[PDB]
Amino acid sequence: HMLEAKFEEASLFKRIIDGFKDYVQLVNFQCKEDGIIAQAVDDSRVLLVSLEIGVEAFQEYRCDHPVTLGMDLTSLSKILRCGNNTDTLTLIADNTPDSIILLFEDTKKDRIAEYSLKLMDIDADFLKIEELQYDSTLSLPSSEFSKIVRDLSQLSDSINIMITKETIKFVADGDIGSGSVIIKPFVDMEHPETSIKLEMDQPVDLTFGAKYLLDIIKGSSLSDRVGIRLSSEAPALFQFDLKSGFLQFFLAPKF
């Protein structure tokens, strides 16, 4: 077995796939000695999803040679929904593979579910995320960010994120009515995951497609917190941190 990736948590690969599947259905997953990366972006080039899973996210990880797993995520998620979470999930691939193997094993129950998925040929042209500075860097609980997006999206196809000194303001205005949610940087010491953190180098007022924010918050299951980095000259970066790695959404604002 050239590739043998045993997830620490079976739910993790399932929750990772959730960040991708409803946006771009066919995604190339590249495996290397140092772990797994994946990117997805449609023709509009407006939203880019970028994953990185490091070795430490696995119980055992081994990848002899670089492998690209071209996967239809619709199929992959059906199969992944066959797992129990009380299951260990092992990805198994061989030299120049036609198929990926998913090996669900039940602890102490003597059950082995082995699934195989035929791989697809996908032209994944990669982009090294060119690293830049952001005008504002923000972080809040992911479930809080999610409720904000879900709500304002009831009112508009556009959601505005406005950063001024010590103020984060999410705004939407549509036909039925308007919505506004303002949050202030708090530092909770008893419970730091609930903290609201803000660093503003320059104020920003960016407007985003609500469909894309709705795509992004599909990553909320992956991390207690989402990091938002905003730019008046480049895409915003919405990131969910993994134990080893991240799911990044790069989103281009509107005019």
Curated annotation (Swiss-Prot):
A Pfam family recorded for this sequence: PCNA_C
Subcellular location field: Nucleus
Top-level taxon of the source organism: Eukaryota
PTM statement from Swiss-Prot or TrEMBL: Sumoylated on Lys-165, and to a lesser extent on Lys-128 by the UBC9/SIZ1 complex during S-phase; which impairs ubiquitination and function in DNA repair.
Cross-link (Glycyl lysine isopeptide (Lys-Gly) (interchain with G-Cter in ubiquitin)): 165
Free-text function comment from the UniProt entry: This protein is an auxiliary protein of DNA polymerase delta and is involved in the control of eukaryotic DNA replication by increasing the polymerase's processibility during elongation of the leading strand. Involved in DNA repair.
BP-aspect Gene Ontology terms: error-free translesion synthesis; establishment of mitotic sister chromatid cohesion; lagging strand elongation; leading strand elongation; maintenance of DNA trinucleotide repeats; meiotic mismatch repair; mismatch repair; mitotic cell cycle
A GO MF label: identical protein binding
Alphabetical keyword list: DNA damage, DNA repair, DNA replication, DNA-binding, Isopeptide bond, Nucleus, Ubl conjugation
GO cellular component: chromosome, telomeric region; nucleus; PCNA complex; replication fork
Cross-link Glycyl lysine isopeptide (Lys-Gly) (interchain with G-Cter in SUMO): where in chain: 128, 165
Keyword Transport tagged: no
DNA-binding region boundaries: 62-81
Family per record: Belongs to the PCNA family.
Quaternary organization: Homotrimer. Interacts with RAD30. Interacts with MCM10. Interacts with UBP10.
Protein name per UniProt: Proliferating cell nuclear antigen
Entry-linked Gene3D superfamilies: DNA Polymerase III, subunit A, domain 2
Key word DNA-binding present: yes
Predominant localisation class: nucleus
PANTHER family (UniProt xref): PROLIFERATING CELL NUCLEAR ANTIGEN
